[PDB]
Amino acid sequence: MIDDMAVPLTFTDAAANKVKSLISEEENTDLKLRVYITGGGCSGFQYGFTFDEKVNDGDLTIEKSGVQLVIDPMSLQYLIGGTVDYTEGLEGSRFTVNNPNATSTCGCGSSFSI
């Protein structure tokens, strides 16, 4: 096997699509996504995505559906083994991620709404 790809937060397929799609449109060649910290609360569940083909020393890299993902250590601890998925369209390019620090633990206490 390898020893570079697949490290922390694993994203979906579309998140890759948003990259390989607009990057290929840039005429770059085959950009590699590069996540950063852009969540909401103190935990984090979003993380801003950019198209960085270079590398970014001290940046873990996870291969993508059609490209390569590389996030910064700062996010590394925020996204750790979480899950991300992208859903762009009319409503707008919405981003959603899930991790232990984000979801956290409640203790199972009914489920409805606010």
- Taking alpha carbons only, the member of 67, 83, 66, 108 closest to residue 8 is 83
SS3 11: strand
CATH topology of domain 9-104: Hypothetical Protein Aq_1857; Chain: A; (2.60.300)
CA distance 50 to 67: 12
CA distance 92 to 75: 23
Binding site, annotated residues: 42, 106, 108
Domain residue ranges in the chain: 9-104
Name residue 73's amino acid.
P
Binding site, annotated residues for iron-sulfur cluster: 42, 106, 108
- Taking alpha carbons only, the member of 23, 32, 47, 41 closest to residue 95 is 47
DSSP 30-92: S-EEEE----SSSS-S---EEE--S--SS-EEEE-SSSEEEE-HHHHHHHTT-EEEEE-SSS-
- Taking alpha carbons only, the member of 74, 49, 88, 60 closest to residue 4 is 60
**Cβ atoms of residues 98 and 12 within 8 Å:** no
3-state secondary structure string across 82-95: CEEEEECCCCCCEE
Q: Which residues pair with 84 in a beta bridge?
A: 11, 97
